[PDB]
Ligand binder design. Sequence first.
Ligand SMILES: O=C(CCCOc1cccc(Br)c1)N[C@H]1CCSC1=O
Ligand SMILES: O=C(CCCOc1cccc(Br)c1)N[C@H]1CCSC1=O
Lengths: 161, 162
Amino acid sequence: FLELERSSGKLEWSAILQKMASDLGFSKILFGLLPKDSQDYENAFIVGNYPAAWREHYDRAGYARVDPTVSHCTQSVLPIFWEPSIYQTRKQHEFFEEASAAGLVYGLTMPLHGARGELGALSLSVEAENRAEANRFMESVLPTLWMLKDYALQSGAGLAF
Amino acid sequence: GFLELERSSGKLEWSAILQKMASDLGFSKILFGLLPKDSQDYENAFIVGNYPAAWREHYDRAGYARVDPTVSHCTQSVLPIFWEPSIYQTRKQHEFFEEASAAGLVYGLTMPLHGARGELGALSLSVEAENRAEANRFMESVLPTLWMLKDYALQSGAGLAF
Ligand SMILES: O=C(CCCOc1cccc(Br)c1)N[C@H]1CCSC1=O
Ligand SMILES: O=C(CCCOc1cccc(Br)c1)N[C@H]1CCSC1=O
């Protein structure tokens, strides 16, 4: 994990994080971080390879207020798996279907809460033949991910702003 | 594998569960402490564990919160800090280490806690060992489990404290 700490710039750091995630077996990621006093977007540091059409769709639809992982991050330090049970409201149901259309189906989000009051998330999505396979995989690497998210948080917070 | 923590209904039951989890991982002494957002009110911090009472009192009276290198570390980082000679840098910190050792707190680590609602704290665990090579073997073997444990302890502890 030391390679993240030793990155000098955002481009280098992002490429290292993306490669680490890929080597682990996740094809898509989002790392997002806000400074302490900031609420919604605006000065958010966002990296990764989420589909650009999804990012724009999400913003226009005001999905920060719909996405169940966002509310979860505001109240918890524990991972939230993208299971059907988290998409409860009608808007969350459509959110799930639209995310799926954009290729985001199986995954998890690790909330990020930095020492300086940074608020964010490391989300990782996996391609799998089915949900059971995706969950077996995520469980198999969970302790590694749990360390990764804190290393990414500490190093990213130092570069983000 | 940490479900007992969240399900715990009271501070005494929760404390005992956490102490047993730490013991099972090889650590006979722990401190779990949490303060609310932007607070330095240690008098009203949520503190559990089994550090020697003589050490706690000494620490408080000497104002060691301002000397202990693990406290300043927690303020700036989410990463663990191992209790190694290299962390005791100032003259006062060398004295701190000597006294901490007189109280049996030579080997261990501190995991900083930063809660979703701004809580600040630490899960500290001390291990008994003959030397640091042995202590390191003991700690390295359970580090990934501790890393998850500290966050489960934070989430559940923050609910009970605040
Ligand atoms: O990755 C996410 C967002 C996770 C949370 O992101 C956050 C949360 C708080 C602050 C910031 Br910046 C980003 N959602 C996923 C769920 C399935 S589809 C999708 O976009
Ligand atoms: O366990 C600790 C203290 C860890 C940090 O504790 C904290 C930090 C922030 C808020 C609160 Br409450 C407690 N120190 C150890 C180092 C060796 S001897 C000793 O007491």
